[model samples]
Target: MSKARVYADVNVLRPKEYWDYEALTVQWGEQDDYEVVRKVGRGKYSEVFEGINVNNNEKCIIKILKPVKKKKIKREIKILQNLCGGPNIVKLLDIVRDQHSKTPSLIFEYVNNTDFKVLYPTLTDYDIRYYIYELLKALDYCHSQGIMHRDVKPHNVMIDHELRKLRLIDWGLAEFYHPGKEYNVRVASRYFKGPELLVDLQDYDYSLDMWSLGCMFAGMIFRKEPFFYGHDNHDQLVKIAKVLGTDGLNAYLNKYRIELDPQLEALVGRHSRKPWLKFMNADNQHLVSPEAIDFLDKLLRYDHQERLTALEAMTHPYFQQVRAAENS
Candidate 1:
């Protein structure tokens, strides 16, 4: 019976039509309007390419969606439309489907993005703060509107360092929140999945994104590609338990009425919580400040309900400089 500490009734209070994305009828544009220029990336569900809007010669991104349930496609388009013009959200300019093949594609505003690996290393301490502050805007806005971006990671966050801009993309796994609803536990990418998801908690909330944000924050500050490097889903909990410790995991399980199987329990047997300082070294010492550790600590808690809300996180001391910069 866990409920969000903040904004728990957002969907309950909003009109039914607002949260009902399945009923959306996508107004498809002409397929010939956008032309693929070059393949930019690939995903489990989408083939991405840099494209040109033929009518106006404007650059844009074309995501040719892979075949899946028709209902899923409608959900993505509806959420994008609902979130359009909000803070730091990726703009979906047009939705078009192949006239003959009937393959659906979404066209987005073009962003000049440098690969995250190439970009993250060049960032100064302030750069990390500034960009994270920017990312938080998108998170807070979506959560306020009763949506959760189950997947939050560097790859999904498009950063244009030159313009000092960011857009949180990929709403495929996102969903509208309804209190006490049991959501699919299989949501975020493995490395960023929260303790709740790993432990099979079906009723989760926006705090799931905060845990992923914490994971991303830890990786950025520690220079670890993934703060939790688990081999598989089971090992993923082992990875988290090794750091957050089994005692907290026990308390959380007890509170939530969850029980681990005997064999799974043995695999995660007896490990003390590791200290955050143990991860610091010459390469990342500068980013691993006291405020950084404090802020990260608040977000990575074992209880999903205990994690910071997106707005609460934005007020942490870790972003003081960034906040000051924004105001003065």
Candidate 2:
């Protein structure tokens, strides 16, 4: 059967050290080297704190992972190690465990990030292009290394506006890509899920990240918190169909021979594709340009393979300003 595997030979051809999880061993560090300053964020899998390096007093982030399978924890650590020194990825400084409870904690470089809810609304057209361009570098690098960041959203993206730095954080949902292997479709967040995931297509790959990027891009340019806000997973596709149109959704399903659940099929009433211009308003017209609309249009596609690869997206005309600035 035909499948969408971008880095099909990554794990298959590499040494066992590249993808074998069971053979990996954790080198635990001392928790006493860090002190928590305040709670910064939380997720279903982790509690994040703004912390300090006791030896240097330099700020860092301490992520205490919630209880889960030991194998899952190892996978995250292994992936992070593999991608270390790559552009825009969160740096892993140390790994420690609570002495009493054996809870694992990850130490990472601290970013003075302004929350996206407050920061995105204040950004100019140039700011959006510059940061998203920087984000693509990270995405492309990971994809090249045969890693798929299943979760790509504004929350996991840390921006220090003053330095114009962008860091893609939270590798907990990331997985190594092996061609033709079925992956768990329940990977990404509700609003940012790619069509392959929502429709239960398991042999997905790097293209999944492009879809999540599109959702975030739509919110930035359109001033909608989430371009697709669904009440539930079933309703999520309905929300996408409202914009992408049901006809396009059906074509995607037909191409892959996907069958819909009765509950989802009931919710998938026909819808016409909405124009990108319809989303432009007085509040966000400044960010809406021909290039901006065109860039977003390509990323948010029903077929994952149809979305632009991160490398291709960097060359898009929408990022001309960013490219010029980088060279000049």
Candidate 3:
């Protein structure tokens, strides 16, 4: 089984209690303490609402979970508790359940977020670097803590442009990383899914998140909402192969000793590696600098081990201006 290049032994060194999320006993908060203000949005697992803390009248987000397995609920809570208040990670203030119905809800700090479709088009080159660096802070912190946010997508990230605030939200699909463990390949959104997932590489690691970030970064720079437009899981890999080429995919499968389904193999066919410069156009050229292309290339590798670690990604020359801005 393959392991992450860095932070592979994080869980190994830590006590068993830290990584044993299923054993966690949740401390449910008082549901009456918060009142729903308005509907925010709905997720596959929960109905989100803007809420107010009754006592202090503080704005908050109440994520009323739908009927899901108890273990999934526990895992989300445990992961959130583990990463709470770290860098750009979302703050989980409380976990509450309705007394009669017993439907659980998680309370989080309210963020005034604009929809990414509306905001991304307005972002300047500096804005992308600044926010992506902020995102890296969250990713690096979680990786160090031995957690993998399986679902890394634009919808999961909340950005408050007015406050220059960003939060990586949605911990439901996240899991603690243990070296040499097989994971569910059904994690992450289709467009943001990594090559490892599409190829059914269960023994993947934190690099999965980097690939998702690369998809996001690619979209931002190219003015395409999803750089790889795929209809389904099988088509997803085909979409990736069309650009990254079929040769690299075969090399990755061979290195991991992975065998693709015959049907999938036939669908992928063959393609030449498309150059990054070919994606540039007048509309997106302003945001697509040389350093940005270099950074994107590193993150979008076919081999999971080859993708840049979140910590390493933050130091790339693409983020040089963002780092400089932080210094002065």
Candidate 2 C-alpha error for residue 323, in Å: 0.9
In candidate 2 the C-alpha lDDT for residue 285 amounts to 92
Which pairs clash in the backbone of model 3?
none
**TM-score of model number 1:** 0.98
* Whole-model lDDT, model 3: 0.94
In order, what lDDT does every prediction score? 0.91, 0.92, 0.94
User: Using Cα atoms with residue i matched to residue i, what is each candidate's TM-score against the true structure?
Assistant: 0.98, 0.98, 0.99
Q: Per-residue alpha-carbon lDDT of model 3 for 1-328, expressed as tens digits?
A: 7999999899898988788888999898899999999998898899999999999999999999999899999989888988978999999999999989899999999999999999999999999999999999999999999999989999999999999999999999999998899999999999999999998899999999999999999999999988999999999999999999999999999999999998999999999999998999999999988899999999999998999999999999999888988998
Query: Per-residue CA lDDT of candidate 1, range 256-312, in tens?
Result: 999887877888898899989999999999999999999999999999888889998
Q: Which stretches of candidate 1 lie over 4 Å from their true place?
A: none
Over 4 Å off in model 2, which ranges? none
Candidate 2 similarity to native, TM-score: 0.98
